Amino acid sequence: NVAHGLAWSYYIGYLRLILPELQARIRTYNQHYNNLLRGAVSQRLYILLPLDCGVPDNLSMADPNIRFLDKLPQQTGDRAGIKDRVYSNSIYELLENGQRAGTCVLEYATPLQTLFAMSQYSQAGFSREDRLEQAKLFCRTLEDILADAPESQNNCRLIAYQEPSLSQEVLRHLRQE
């Protein structure tokens, strides 16, 4: 349904184009930019998938243990008539007991915002109960696309969750690899 088109739109428009050349940006940020004494940013992009489609624009305010650190060197590409369209990513630190536990490139999945707004708009004809299924369907279709993909070899880890600690949730995924 709607999530299927958004899931493919996510892969074709963003993931297919930044995942193949994300490791090099992380290498550049670790070697030439990262504080000489603050460890290394992980090699994988971690994508948050809140099934309730609650996607705040600032990660830091969604969890005190998560706070912005830096941005990777931005990626530019001529896209659909725009010269040097800028694809940017933000590096975040994860705090356990007040000490930095993990550093990674973390972001939400923006198509989930689009689903949330469509449920809020009258002309979209989208219901709140419809949203919760489309949120799950979006994650499924995204998983299927990345399962056979020449860009998500070891570049992309999905983080889905339903709320009855996000920092502990993300940390859980980093330590599994």
Binding site for a second copy (CB under 8 A): 1-6, 8-9, 12-13, 48, 55-59, 68, 71, 74, 77-86, 88-90, 106-111, 113-114, 117-118, 121, 123-124, 144-145, 148
Min dist CB 87 to a second copy, Å, is 8
Q: Which of 149, 35, 36 is nearest to 91 (CA)?
A: 35
Sign of CA dihedral 65, 71, 77, 82: positive
Residue 88 annotated as part of some ligand binding site:
yes
Residue 14 annotated as part of some ligand binding site:
yes
Copy the structure tokens of residue 132: 């919760």
- Please give the residue whose beta carbon sits closest to ligand WY8 in the complex: 13
Q: Which of 33, 64, 82, 153 touches ligand WY8 by CB under 6 A? A: 82
What is the SS3 string spanning 93-121? Answer: EEEECCEEEEEEEEEECHHHHHHHHHHHC
Annotated binding site for 2',3'-cGAMP: 9, 14, 85, 110
